[PDB]
Amino acid sequence: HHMKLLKIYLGEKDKHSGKPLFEYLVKRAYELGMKGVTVYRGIMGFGHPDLPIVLEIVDEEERINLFLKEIDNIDFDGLVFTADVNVVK
Amino acid sequence: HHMKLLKIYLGEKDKHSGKPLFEYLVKRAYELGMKGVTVYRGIMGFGHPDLPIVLEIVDEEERINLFLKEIDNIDFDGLVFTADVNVVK
Amino acid sequence: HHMKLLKIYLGEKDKHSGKPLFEYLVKRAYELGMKGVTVYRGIMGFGHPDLPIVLEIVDEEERINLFLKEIDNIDFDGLVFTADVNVVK
Ligand SMILES: Nc1ncnc2c1ncn2[C@@H]1O[C@H](COP(=O)(O)OP(=O)(O)O)[C@@H](O)[C@H]1O
Ligand SMILES: Nc1ncnc2c1ncn2[C@@H]1O[C@H](COP(=O)(O)OP(=O)(O)O)[C@@H](O)[C@H]1O
Numbered sequence: 001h002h003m004k005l006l007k008i009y010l011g012e013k014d015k016h017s018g019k020p021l022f023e024y025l026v027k028r029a030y031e032l033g034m035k036g037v038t039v040y041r042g043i044m045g046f047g048h049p050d051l052p053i054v055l056e057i058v059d060e061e062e063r064i065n066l067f068l069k070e071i072d073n074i075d076f077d078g079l080v081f082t083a084d085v086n087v088v089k
Numbered sequence: 090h091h092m093k094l095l096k097i098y099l100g101e102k103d104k105h106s107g108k109p110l111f112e113y114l115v116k117r118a119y120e121l122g123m124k125g126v127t128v129y130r131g132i133m134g135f136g137h138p139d140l141p142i143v144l145e146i147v148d149e150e151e152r153i154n155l156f157l158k159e160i161d162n163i164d165f166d167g168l169v170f171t172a173d174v175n176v177v178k
Numbered sequence: 179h180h181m182k183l184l185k186i187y188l189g190e191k192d193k194h195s196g197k198p199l200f201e202y203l204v205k206r207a208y209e210l211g212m213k214g215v216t217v218y219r220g221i222m223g224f225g226h227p228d229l230p231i232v233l234e235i236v237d238e239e240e241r242i243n244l245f246l247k248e249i250d251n252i253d254f255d256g257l258v259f260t261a262d263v264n265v266v267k
């Protein structure tokens with residue numbers, strides 16, 4: 001059963017409306033009906049103390065795409081990628 | 090050198106025989122002769138304080154499959170997926 | 179936009195010139211002009227307290243390859259793999 005993994009990297013100090021962006025992302029994920037999310041905190045990072053936050057979502061491609069369309073209206077740096085995975089039931 | 094990544098997401102409060110399921114998984118992994126395992130703890134998650142636990146195993150497909158056959162007899166929710174990776178020697 | 183994910187697993191107690199190897203890796207990554215790195219610490223692991231350290235780099239294949247050529251001169255155990263991902267802009 002084919003799915004996409006969506007991985008989002010951002011900083012903990014990143015804000016949306018003064019409030020933590022990663023919390024806002026997890027909350028949009030939930031409001032959109034995503035199957036789930038897992039959030040990690042790193043110990044070190046750089047892109048281009050403010051620690052990496054990483055979200056992983058495994059969902060149907062259509063759902064990841066819908067979420068991507070929301071993420072688009074948000075200015076943060078970090079990184080977004082997807083990858084194909086096979087979910088086992 | 091082709092391998093599979095197997096990724097398992099579960100809750101920290103999940104139990105097998107009253108004892109922590111993630112510890113039981115790591116222990117089966119070891120008893121089966123898996124090449125390795127890495128275990129992470131998240132800071133937030135949801136599916137469908139109890140924090141996400143994630144296991145990653147990179148191994149031969151045959152081995153991941155054998156492990157899958159054990160995981161099948163266990164009732165937990167969470168998520169299991171595999172993905173192709175290329176291991177460098 | 180195709181990229182590679184490079185994932186490196188090593189122990190926290192691993193050393194390069196008496197100094198922590200993971201810090202040395204992150205520092206080479208930066209000196210080579212990698213697009214970024216994210217570093218995680220696990221809670222448990224085995225291969226074949228010394229906790230897993232995991233680095234993730236998402237970059238152009240050419241860059242990951244160049245980094246691989248440096249990693250080659252270093253003796254540590256752990257694990258290195260790559261995987262194809264699609265970065266969204
Ligand atoms: N190419 C990448 N590979 C792995 N992690 C990355 C990459 N790009 C960004 N990240 C992660 O995202 C975090 C946030 O990125 P970024 O905002 O661009 O800025 P910064 O350099 O100030 O941390 C980084 O610190 C890093 O952990
Ligand atoms: N589709 C998913 N994507 C990313 N992480 C997931 C997904 N599904 C489940 N998880 C992770 O697995 C954890 C355990 O899942 P679950 O048992 O289904 O219940 P819960 O909602 O009570 O946390 C979740 O909290 C989450 O971290």
Ligand SMILES: Nc1ncnc2c1ncn2[C@@H]1O[C@H](COP(=O)(O)OP(=O)(O)O)[C@@H](O)[C@H]1O
Pocket residue numbers: 124125126127128145146147148187188189220222223224225226229230231254255256257
């Ligand atoms: N096949 C693997 N799958 C997942 N993680 C691995 C794998 N191989 C190694 N690792 C991670 O790398 C860490 C360092 O590996 P290793 O040096 O080989 O020795 P050790 O058994 O002494 O921890 C492991 O503890 C583990 O977290």
